Amino acid sequence: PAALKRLAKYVIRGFYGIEHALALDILIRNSCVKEEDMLELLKFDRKQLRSVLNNLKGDKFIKCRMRYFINYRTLVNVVKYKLDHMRRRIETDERDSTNRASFKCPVCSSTFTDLEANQLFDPMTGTFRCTFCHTEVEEDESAMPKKDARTLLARFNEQIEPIYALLRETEDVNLAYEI
Amino acid sequence: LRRNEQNGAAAHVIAEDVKLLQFHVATMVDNELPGLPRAMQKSGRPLK
Amino acid sequence: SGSSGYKFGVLAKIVNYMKTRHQRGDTHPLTLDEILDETQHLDIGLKQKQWLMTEALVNNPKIEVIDGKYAFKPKYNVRDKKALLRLLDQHDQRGLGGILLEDIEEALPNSQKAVKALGDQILFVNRPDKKKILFFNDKSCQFSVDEEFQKLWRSVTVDSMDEEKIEEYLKR
Ligand SMILES: [Zn+2]
Numbered sequence: 001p002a003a004l005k006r007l008a009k010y011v012i013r014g015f016y017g018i019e020h021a022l023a024l025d026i027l028i029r030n031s032c033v034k035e036e037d038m039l040e041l042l043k044f045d046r047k048q049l050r051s052v053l054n055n056l057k058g059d060k061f062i063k064c065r066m067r068y069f070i071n072y073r074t075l076v077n078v079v080k081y082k083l084d085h086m087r088r089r090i091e092t093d094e095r096d097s098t099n100r101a102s103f104k105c106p107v108c109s110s111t112f113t114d115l116e117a118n119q120l121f122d123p124m125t126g127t128f129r130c131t132f133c134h135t136e137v138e139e140d141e142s143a144m145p146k147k148d149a150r151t152l153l154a155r156f157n158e159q160i161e162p163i164y165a166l167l168r169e170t171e172d173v174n175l176a177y178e179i
Numbered sequence: 180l181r182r183n184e185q186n187g188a189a190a191h192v193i194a195e196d197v198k199l200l201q202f203h204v205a206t207m208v209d210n211e212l213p214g215l216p217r218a219m220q221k222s223g224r225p226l227k
Numbered sequence: 228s229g230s231s232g233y234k235f236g237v238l239a240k241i242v243n244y245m246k247t248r249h250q251r252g253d254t255h256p257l258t259l260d261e262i263l264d265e266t267q268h269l270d271i272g273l274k275q276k277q278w279l280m281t282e283a284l285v286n287n288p289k290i291e292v293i294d295g296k297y298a299f300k301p302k303y304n305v306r307d308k309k310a311l312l313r314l315l316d317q318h319d320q321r322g323l324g325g326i327l328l329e330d331i332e333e334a335l336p337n338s339q340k341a342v343k344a345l346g347d348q349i350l351f352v353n354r355p356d357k358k359k360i361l362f363f364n365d366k367s368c369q370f371s372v373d374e375e376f377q378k379l380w381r382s383v384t385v386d387s388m389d390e391e392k393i394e395e396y397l398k399r
Contacts, residue, residue: 013369015379019352024362026316043324043355043361055190058385077391084394085382091397156373163370184380 003177007032007170008079013063015082020052027062027072034070058164081173090157096150102140108133111144232278233271240266240314241279242287242300249299249306250332259284285305306333308340315362322362327353330360 005028012024026033026041033041036051042049057064059082062072101114111134112120120137122129128137161168180196184209210226214217217225243263248254248265259280263269271279284290289300299305306329314322331337337360344351344362352361384390 011369014363014372015375017367018350018363019354021365021369022352022361025363040324043321043359044353045358047309048354058383060385081384081394082382084391084398086378087376088394089381090396160370163372177295183378187376188380 001174001177003170003174004074004079007167007174008074008165010170011079011082016056020055021104023049023052023056024061027056027074030062030072030074032067032071033062033070034067034072036069046146074138080171083164083167086157088158091159093153094150096146096153098147098150099140099145102144103128104143105133105135106141107135108136111140112137139168152171230282231280232275232283234268237266237268237271238279238283238287240268242328245299246298248302250334252334254299254305256293256298258296262297302329308334311340311344311349311362312347315364318363322360325360325362327355327357327360 009028011023012028013021015021016024023038023044024043026038035053038044038047038049046051053064055064059078060076061078062074063076064070065072102111103114103117103120104111108130110130112131117128120128120131128139129135130137180193180200183192183196202215203218205212205215206226209215211217220226241259243261244265244360245257248257257265259276260269263271263276263279287300289303291298291300291303304323311322314320314325327337330340341351348364349362350364352363353359354361
C-alpha cells in the first residue's frame with residue numbers, strides 16, 4: 001500500500017536517472033496514468049516519454065497493464081527482487097577470492113603457484129628463479145593481490161546498507177502488511 | 180559493447196551492437212551464407 | 228483571400244508590440260487605438276480600424292480584453308519571474324505547465340534565472356530541447372551510492388522466472 005509505494009519511491013529515486021525518476025514520481029500514483037494523461041501529468045516529449053516508459057518496462061514498474069485509455073497499477077514483486085539482488089551482490093563482493101599463492105616473474109609476466117616452487121627454486125644458490133623466463137623470480141607478495149580488492153569491494157556494498165536500512169525497514173513493514 | 184552496457188548504455192545502441200557481434204561470430208563460422216554480407220579484409224578481399 | 232485591410236499583418240505587428248512591452252517589463256492595459264499609436268499605424272483609416280476590431284481581433288482564439296483596454300493574450304498569467312520555488316512547492320501543478328517560450332524573456336534571460344535556480348532547491352530538466360521546460364525537486368533522499376547503474380545492469384532477468392526462487396533458497 002502506502003508502505004510499498006514509499007519503499008518503491010526511495011529505490012527508484014536513487015535508481016533511474018533524475019528524468020526517469022521524474023516519470024516514476026507520477027507513476028508512484030499508479031492510476032489511469034496513460035501516455036495521453038502523462039503528456040499533461042509529466043508533460044515529457046511524446047516519443048521520448050514512450051522511450052523512457054520502455055526503460056521502466058525492463059522492471060515493468062506499472063506492469064504496462066493494457067486497459068484507448070491505459071490504466072497502470074503496481075503489483076510487481078520486482079522492487080523486492082531488486083533489494084534482494086543488492087544483498088546478493090554484497091555476498092558476491094565478499095566472495096572475490098584471496099591472493100592464493102604466487103611468486104611472479106616480472107620479466108616474462110608469468111605467475112607461479114607455490115607447489116611449482118619445488119621446481120622454480122634453484123638448488124645451488126637457493127635463489128628462486130624463473131623457468132621459461134630464466135630471470136630471478138620475484139615473490140608476488142603485494143603484487144597480484146585478490147584479497148585487498150575483495151575486502152574493499154565488500155566494504156563499499158556494506159556502506160550502502162545503513163543508507164538502505166530505512167528501505168529494508170519499509171520492506172519489512174510491507175511484509176507485515178502482506179501477512 | 181561491454182563498456183557501453185557497463186557504462187551509460189542507451190540500449191538502442193545495444194540492439195545494434197548485438198547485430199555486429201552476431202554478424203562477426205557468424206563470419207568466423209562461414210564467410211558467405213545467404214544474405215550475410217561477405218566480410219572483406221581490404222578493398223574487396225572476402226575473409227577466408 | 229477573404230477581406231484584408233490596408234497593410235497585411237497589421238494585427239500581427241500589433242500583437243508583437245503588445246508582446247514587446249510585457250517582455251520589457253513595462254506592463255499596461257492598452258486600447259486598440261493605443262496599440263495602433265505605438266505601432267504608428269493609428270492613421271490606418273476608419274474602415275481599416277473597424278475591420279481590425281470586427282475581424283482581426285475576433286479571429287485570435289486567445290484574445291483577452293478586460294473592458295475598455297485590451298490585455299496580454301498569449302499568456303493569461305503575468306510574467307512575474309518570481310515565486311518559482313512556490314510553483315515547485317505544488318508538485319501536482321508542476322510549475323503550472325511552464326513553457327520555455329514563455330521563459331527566456333519573462334523579465335530576464337533564462338541563463339541568469341538558471342544560475343539562481345541551480346543555487347536554489349529548484350532543478351530544471353528539459354525533455355524537449357527548446358519546446359518546454361520542467362521544474363522538479365528530487366530532494367537529497369536519492370543516493371548515488373556505488374556502481375548503481377552496474378547493479379541495475381546485473382538485474383536484467385525481466386521476463387525470466389525462478390530467479391526469485393534462487394534468492395528465497397539463499398534466504399531460507
Ligand atoms: Zn619468467
